[PDB]
């Protein structure tokens, strides 16, 4: 169709309008005293929320050229969120601040590329300083404290998180399942997680968690491509007559087969989910074999003398539960006997010494870890189903925060962390090779205080005086919007994982650079 | 339907508006510091790009008369790109410069035909000078250096390209396939490439590469026309039950057969691709026989006593992979045994002495080279699939640049090459037989500096002073927009193949002549 | 009041519209077969004219910015006309041609200052060539022939002009007065002409001749400024009671005195005219004394002991007639006795040897010439007053043409002269130091053929073929629009004085340069 093209300021200002309109809605839900945002529902009463994730997801504008910036900032915010579990509100606010300051200098005739380079230099310096301000958290007591703080002073959640992490590994897999009692419980079951997601968003069945969950399904293993629906019809018919859900692991599924699976999932004909097999090259067969032996199934392949047209339910693997997310899929309580699993673990461990390179050895070690480590399952316990729903979400959020916290430590939250990092970086000595790079540095130095300013503004106080008072303090000293007091932010349990702040700042800087160095904009004509 | 006609300046100005609207968007992505361009996607986040190929492809103006110039300049830019692998950004910029200067003289009452002739004379002189400025590259060390420079200082890519080119031939066929390890690997397999493309764009399956790729397909050989779908239904049914893809080589396919194949490819019913058989006349049968013996198949023909209605899978040839591009199709690892292939090579080599003419002998030599040379396959190796995707594209771009570079040598890139050629041609003595031809010469002399001017402008510096300083230097001395320094452009590894610049200049001159000597403009009425 | 400012092309195009619309009206009255132009009169029937002078004078446009160019071109045309007696139609046409061609190059980005310099170079070369093409006319037979040709084959007019010029001097003063018989007569009377005109256009009384004529007036001589009306009221009242007209010669008149004189002339109270005294410095007193002794009056001055408050009619000079033009004033038949005039002539001639410098000697010689030469009066004779009016105008036009012709010779008229000069200059070798200067040369080379093209177009023939045929001929060969034949233009009596063509070309070049190098334009706001 016909396109409409906008150049220079006439397009940068539309980007700015879009990002400003997205951020003005998102930032009202930032801080302990964040305001409410009312969102229309198609039917029934409007939904009111005070979290940035839901408000941002619903925001998309009428004008296409503003929607461009809105969606790019939303995408970078979601990229920040999915890897840290929080900060998408912070990332959008930081991006708005950086862009709003950057357009002032761009309109001043200053070089956009040098502005981008100065912004990158300042962000690199601030991130490098965050690695020093951050307090590490590796002791079980520290892990429990961080979990309790993230779970709103619920000590049981923190204790359960610590007990799951300290025996399965800080890099281990932890999942949450509804418990059978009032007290939370945990267990280790045979399972693994691999970095493969569902191939279509229609596969999801839990919009609240944005994941696909199947209960006691069959596992289909294939090492070749699947495009023809006929190639798996006799197997899916057996699965449907069996009545249990289906998880299909293949090299790829596309075309009429994928379309038919999507239609079946939408119509409720059969509960199906298809993901790409993990790894590539020769690692593909090893991954498929390990998954099959873990789920008790057999890989369907010509080299092993089986065909999908004749495959039966006996060849298929099975497990208690499989969770399919956007980036990774995990298997819970595979049907494989522990004896064969341990034998294969020993086989892989002795093949480790057969590695021809450090890359081979590290992949074999990853295989050993993903196979022998199992999956930690947290049985969240509470009195009622209504309390079940809330406690499960709280435990999941605490688990994500602890996973982020244990990797990079904790840092004074509420936006004080960025101020401390900025002051430390400036004291270290930060300069640009050009006056344009100097303005780029100034842009980030002014923008990194925006999260605290907006938290204070939503709290109702005057931003400038609070920011000045926070800057006059040193260390963990900061402002607590929940109570309005000044003191050690860590001591009151107001924390953010260093990963969250670092990722928010870096993604905001990236999107700000992209929409500062943008000179042309192409969109569909009205 | 209703037509609308525009004459003289009232049409030339619409052509100029179209080409200007295309080039203003394209040129922002020119140079090492090219800006970003945001392009709308039907769903999801907008795509941001800084390459001219993608930005140009998306441009479709609203007004038909402007879209005429936009699409014609886009077509000539694509013709530049597909034969050199780069320069479509340069070609559009040069065409915009030439047309914008030419309209000034056309409005001045000066003769358009003499302007076109002067432009052609100046372009011929500049191209002739480029053949002297260009540094040849034929040594293996030179080939590796050019490959490394084109692949962003990746010495392994350059070494692999050199090792593929030096043993298969500078005119040989080289393809890229995903490797099985971290280190890149190369091999020679039996195969052939012929100048025949897919007969419909719907046959493609890799929009990123704009080619059709089929894995382990069947090869169908026919020497007659195919229009009736019934003529090949029993064969396509056998292929579909076999499940492997189909490649059909015939004199031509059209009508209901082609429509059914397109519908099957779109629906995913069967993976099919149809191309015209290479050659014509008596060469057609020789081409088909060589392809059949290379793929292990048999040609279906009445003169050999076979009919397509009774053809079976045994008659069909097969190979590991076939790649179908717009202009050429290649076959990788044909099923033909090496003994019969070598015997046919000797047969063709002894038939070479039987040639009745030099044209016959050169065609027989082409047969020998294309058959015995095989196909070089580069196994691009890297750690991950994400790194696989980037490294494969980088290797393909380096291969295209090296293929262009080895044919015509390398020349100082960044637009300095055109300035050096212009200065050398002017010093040689360039004149027009008319004042209008003199203005035509001046048009090209001013326009050939536009690429450097826009590279500098995107870099942020002032174009005029940089161009003057470059002109004050001699030889490879020029401006490097990546670092802002002045020096030998070849020594900093900023290069363009002579083919790229020559083709860009010539195609820009051709399209500029067409849009300067245009007096009538016929388009559909609103 | 508020001003409106237009810059660059937005102002140059308004100038061009104004000059184009002025010239499109003026040029229709060019050539022997010039068309008619009908002009509205305030009351009565519209006046129809086929002369450029009247059509141009009535032209002034509604839009101020177009009127700027219209009036500037009109002013330069009038400057051409008043010094040569003809060519204001040619000058406007040449200016239109030069400006219309120069706009094409200015819009082409070509340098306006270099265009102006090239135009000046070409005009200088063409004018230098005109000095060689021009046939001189100094013999009495040649003067009579030129006068007869200018007077539409009236041999009596030419004979009278020759007899007036050959005995009073080719630089002498010749005037036309109504005769007392059918046959024309001439005589020499005591008088002089000085280069001072009327100080206000209200002083004129002959709109047909655009001059002020007074019959048997009084001459007032004063060497000081006059501003107070009281300073001359006692003399003005005496003159009014006397009833004869008044001519006032003073250093300057301004303020209430000038206003009262203007009001009296408009009301018919008294016939008055005031001009500045000729010369300056010590020459002023000599001029006043010579004028007084020629008119029989006495100079009113403090150094001589007379004041204007007590001056009487006896002190005032008198003469038969005084004619006051825009630039010069002449006195006919002064009351001074010839004996005193001859004595003063001898006095000035012996003071010539007393000159301290060549400048003093040449001014003394000018005094001798202007005093002793007298004034030639042509008594135009005809049967009726209606024929009187036409014959007087014809004799005046012939006299002006002869005066212009005798100074610089005659040249083939009808626009052939400019073509011959252009061809001779091009053959001599004419070039510009820049391509912009070359375009400036081409502008004039194309424009100098415009007068012939327009003469032919008004004649009805095709301009291009006639121009080509004229160019194919050499010498005086050209096209005669009166009869449509080709031959020696001089032999058919179609002539233009070299002064007319030279002045027209130079003034057109000047105004074209001014309107080409114009970048800003200021006019009153609506």
Question: What's the quick description here?
Answer:
This is part of a larger assembly, with three copies of chain A (526 residues). Chain A has 526 residues and is α+β, with helices and mostly antiparallel strands.
Number of strands of chain A: 20
Category from helices, strands and their pairing of chain A: alpha+beta
Proportion of strand residues of chain A: 15-25%
Distance N to C terminus of chain A: 10 Å
Please count the helical segments of chain A.
Answer: 18
| Main sheet specs of chain A | 7 strands, mixed
Assembly type: part of a larger assembly
Shape of chain A: globular
Largest Cβ-defined interface: A-B, 43 and 39 residues
**Radius of gyration of chain A, rounded?**
25 Å
Query: What's the helical proportion of residues of chain A?
Result: 40-55%
Family (chains A, B, C): Belongs to the chaperonin (HSP60) family.
Protein name (chains A, B, C): Chaperonin GroEL
Organism (chains A, B, C): Hydrogenophilus thermoluteolus
GO molecular function (chains A, B, C): ATP binding; ATP-dependent protein folding chaperone; isomerase activity; unfolded protein binding
Explain this structure to me?
This is part of a larger assembly, with three copies of chain A (about 525 residues). By secondary structure, chain A is of the alpha+beta class. In chain A, about 50% of the residues lie in helices and about 15% in strands. Chain A has helices at about 10-25, 50-60, 65-85, 90-105, 110-135, 140-150, 155-170, 235-240, 255-265, 280-295, 340-350, 360-370, 385-410, 415-430, 435-445, 450-460, 465-470, 500-515; strands at about 5, 35-40, 45-50, 175-180, 185-190, 190-195, 210-215, 220, 225, 245-250, 250-255, 270-275, 315-325, 330-335, 375-380, 410, 475-480, 485-490, 495, 520-525. In chain A, a hairpin with a 4-residue loop joins β13 (about 315-325) and β14 (about 330-335). In chain A, α1 (about 10-25) runs antiparallel to α4, α6 (about 140-150) crosses α7 (about 155-170) and α11 (about 340-350) packs antiparallel against α12. The first copy, chain A, is globular, with a radius of gyration of 25 Å. Chains in contact: A-B, B-C. The interface of A and B includes residues 2, 5 and 357 of A. Chains A, B, C: Pfam families: Cpn60_TCP1. Chains A, B, C: Its EC number is 5.6.1.7. Chains A, B, C: It is found in: Cytoplasm. Chains A, B, C: Forms a cylinder of 14 subunits composed of two heptameric rings stacked back-to-back. Interacts with the co-chaperonin GroES.
């Amino acid at each position: 169709a016909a396109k409409e093209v906008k150049f220079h300021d006439s397009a940068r200002e539309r980007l700015v309008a879009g990002v400003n309109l997205l951020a003005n809605a998102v930032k009202t839900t930032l801080g302990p005293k964040g305001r409410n945002v009312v969102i229309e529902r198609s039917f029934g009463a409007p939904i009111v929320t005070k979290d940035g994730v839901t408000v941002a997801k619903e925001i998309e504008l009428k004008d296409k050229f503003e929607n461009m910036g809105a969606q790019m900032v939303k995408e970078v915010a979601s990229k920040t969120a999915d890897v840290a579990g929080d900060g998408t509100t912070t990332a959008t606010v930081l991006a708005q601040a950086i862009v709003r300051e950057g357009m002032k200098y761009v309109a001043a005739g200053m070089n956009p590329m040098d502005l981008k380079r100065g912004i990158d230099k300042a962000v690199t310096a601030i991130v490098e300083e965050l690695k020093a301000i951050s307090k590490p958290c590796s002791t079980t007591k520290e892990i429990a404290q961080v979990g309790t703080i993230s779970a709103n002073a619920d000590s049981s959640i923190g204790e359960i998180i610590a007990q799951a992490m300290d025996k399965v590994g800080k890099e281990g897999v932890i999942t949450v399942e509804d418990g059978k009692s009032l007290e939370n419980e945990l267990e280790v079951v045979e399972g693994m997680q691999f970095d493969r997601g569902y191939l279509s968003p229609y596969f999801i069945n839990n919009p609240d968690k944005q994941v696909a969950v199947l209960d006691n399904p069959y596992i289909l293993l294939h090492d070749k491509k699947i495009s023809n629906i006929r190639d798996l019809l006799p197997v899916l018919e057996q699965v449907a007559k069996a009545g249990r859900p289906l998880l299909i692991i293949a090299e790829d599924v596309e075309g009429e087969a994928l379309a038919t699976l999507v239609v079946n999932n939408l119509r409720g004909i059969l509960k199906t989910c298809a993901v790409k097999a993990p790894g590539f090259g020769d690692r593909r067969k090893a991954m498929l074999q390990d998954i099959a032996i873990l789920t008790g199934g057999t890989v369907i392949s010509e080299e092993v003398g089986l065909s999908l047209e004749k495959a039966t339910l006996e060849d298929l693997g099975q497990a208690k539960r499989v969770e399919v997310a956007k980036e990774h899929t995990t298997i819970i309580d595979g049907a494989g006997d522990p004896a064969k699993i341990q034998a294969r673990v020993k086989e892989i461990r002795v093949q480790i010494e057969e590695a021809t390179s450090d890359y081979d050895r590290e992949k074999l070690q990853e295989r050993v870890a993903k196979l022998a480590g199992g999956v930690a399952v947290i049985k969240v316990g509470a009195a009622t189903e209504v309390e079940m729903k809330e406690k499960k979400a709280r435990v999941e959020d605490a688990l994500h925060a602890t996973r982020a916290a244990v990797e990079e430590g904790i840092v004074p939250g509420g936006g004080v962390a960025l101020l401390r990092a900025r002051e430390a970086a400036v004291a270290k000595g930060l300069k640009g090779d050009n006056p344009d790079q100097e303005a780029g540095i100034k842009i980030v130095l002014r923008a990194v205080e925006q999260p605290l300013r907006e938290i204070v503004a939503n709290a109702g106080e005057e931003p400038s005086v609070i920011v000045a008072k926070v800057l006059e303090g040193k260390g963990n000293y900061g402002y607590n919007a929940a109570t309005g007091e000044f003191g050690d932010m860590i001591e009151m349990g107001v924390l953010d994982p260093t990963k969250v702040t670092r990722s928010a700042l870096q993604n905001a800087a990236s999107v700000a650079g992209l929409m500062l160095t943008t000179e042309c904009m192409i969109a569909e004509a009205p």
